[PDB]
Amino acid sequence: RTDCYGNVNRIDTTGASCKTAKPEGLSYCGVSASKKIAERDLQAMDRYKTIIKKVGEKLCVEPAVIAGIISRESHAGKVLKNGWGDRGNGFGLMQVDKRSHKPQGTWNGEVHITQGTTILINFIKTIQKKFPSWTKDQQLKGGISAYNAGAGNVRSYARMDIGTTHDDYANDVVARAQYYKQHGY
Numbered sequence: 001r002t003d004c005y006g007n008v009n010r011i012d013t014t015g016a017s018c019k020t021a022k023p024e025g026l027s028y029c030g031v032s033a034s035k036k037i038a039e040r041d042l043q044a045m046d047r048y049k050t051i052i053k054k055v056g057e058k059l060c061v062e063p064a065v066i067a068g069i070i071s072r073e074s075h076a077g078k079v080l081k082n083g084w085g086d087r088g089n090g091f092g093l094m095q096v097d098k099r100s101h102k103p104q105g106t107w108n109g110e111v112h113i114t115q116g117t118t119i120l121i122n123f124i125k126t127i128q129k130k131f132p133s134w135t136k137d138q139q140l141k142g143g144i145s146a147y148n149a150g151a152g153n154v155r156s157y158a159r160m161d162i163g164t165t166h167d168d169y170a171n172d173v174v175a176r177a178q179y180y181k182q183h184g185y
């Protein structure tokens with residue numbers, strides 16, 4: 001149903017780096033920070049809950065992972081202008097990069113969420129093949145990290161996030177996702 005690629009609750013995470021936390025206005029970093037940020041985005045996220053859940057269910061991926069990606073990428077739309085990110089390259093709640101993929105659908109609809117989730121799954125699969133001695137949950141983590149920096153950037157479990165934005169991509173997303181999971185996603 002939603003567990004084909006792993007369980008976010010089983011992933012170890014160090015959460016948000018200070019590089020992510022601070023700019024968000026917090027004085028502390030880590031797991032708790034990730035969760036506070038996620039909490040600040042819950043109300044806006046809730047506008048898309050049904051759709052997020054629908055896509056998760058359809059593609060067999062945890063909706064909480066989608067929500068965590070959305071929170072990190074666009075704060076659930078809050079920081080977008082007609083769906084575009086600040087540099088004009090990313091489009092939608094999930095910020096599909098126009099330079100690498102032609103964006104499909106409206107910025108906050110099911111088509112877009114599907115496209116973004118598809119890209120994530122493809123990265124999960126790449127990682128599965130690349131590191132077949134890892135546990136599924138570990139592969140999920142790797143996949144999320146690749147979403148940001150590409151699969152080539154994942155060369156190990158321990159340092160996968162070095163090189164992603166703020167050097168904490170997946171660790172942050174996973175922590176955000178753990179919060180969502182607790183809120184019915």
Ligand SMILES: CC(=O)N[C@@H]1[C@@H](O)[C@H](O[C@@H]2O[C@H](CO)[C@@H](O[C@@H]3O[C@H](CO)[C@@H](O)[C@H](O)[C@H]3NC(C)=O)[C@H](O)[C@H]2NC(C)=O)[C@@H](CO)O[C@H]1O
Nearest residue numbers: 090094095096097100101116119147148149150151152165
């Ligand atoms: C400057 C900033 O950090 N910009 C970010 C974007 O890079 C990022 O989008 C993702 O970028 C990576 C690296 O371009 C894309 O990887 C490519 O993915 C395809 C498979 O989808 C693979 O064929 C390519 O070889 C691979 N390229 C490389 C260099 O490895 C990836 O597709 C992008 N993900 C999305 C969803 O478009 C966005 C999103 O996290 O964040 C910006 O910060």
